[PDB]
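Changelog-linked ticket: zinc ion example.
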Amino acid sequence: KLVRLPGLIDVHVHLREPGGTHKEDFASGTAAALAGGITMVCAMPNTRPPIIDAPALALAQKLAEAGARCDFALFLGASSENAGTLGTVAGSAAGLKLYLNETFSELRLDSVVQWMEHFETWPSHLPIVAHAEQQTVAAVLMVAQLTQRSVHICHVARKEEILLIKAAKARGLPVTCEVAPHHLFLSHDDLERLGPGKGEVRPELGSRQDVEALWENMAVIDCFASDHAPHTLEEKCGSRPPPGFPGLETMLPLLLTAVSEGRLSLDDLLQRLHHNPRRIFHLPPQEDTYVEVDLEHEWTIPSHMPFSKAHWTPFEGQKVKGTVRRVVLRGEVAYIDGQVLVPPGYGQDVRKWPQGAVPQLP
Ligand SMILES: [Zn+2]
Ligand SMILES: [Zn+2]
């Protein structure tokens, strides 16, 4: 029989519009989301132009409203110049994203003083998330403590990182974190097959001991999120490959396979792709919205999934059990068996729903 799930939420996607529409756009990426059982996405701001000011946010909002097929919220990006300038639009974003390490972005903040400035000026009731690797996790936690507020750590990939977060939680610090499927299901053992172009990702793939540490410490992981980071194969295999993997269409099948193997429970999945995303990002419910999955269907991930313009996947050849059969989004059939059935523009900005505003003290 099928299993009906609530509408799942991916709090970490790169939809490339505006500026990189050859790699993906709102319409292609949201189709990929629906095919992966995802009905709500939070889009990162490392676009061109980057979403680091009110005019760029307004542009992105209209592009998303015209192109998205599922519902969404848009992150604002911290820059070396915009601390203290975001207060009037902060409430309309998913949250504030800080890039603290080298990756596919122009927004790296060089000085910890700039991190402090953002933590002090961004509204304290609104989410802050960080790309923060290895010791950078400890550094940004220290900034969060100094400014007495929470922080969310994106794509945790290392034993070192999950143990540090575990220690912080044991001391009662307000830290949450997410893990991406490639850091649960791929490792150094896969770099031979992938090669140095396809295999380029930040955070980098970890050792078998890193992967085992994440599974052993699943209780520490608040969310799963894809860090869907599409680039074309030509870009991945070029001289200077951008880091990142596409992942919306493979995330849920990989995790369902783990459920079928007893590696985690259905509830574990629903906490990490629905309940905790809702509560960490204050995201609203979606009325008359659900995902029907088939837990029996065995298949092999092909060389590319149907919808992402990335047109490749690092999970090619992996055997999975579990597939998305049907998605209903706000009372309309949005996806069935490889066919997306809602048009670009069906999706809405959840921060403009009355239930989507983040409550705050007057
Ligand atoms: Zn990142
Ligand atoms: Zn990312």
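Closing comment: Example verified and attached. The pocket of zinc ion (ligand 1) is lined by residues 103, 131, 154-155, 227 (CB under 6 Å). The chain has one domain: 2-349.
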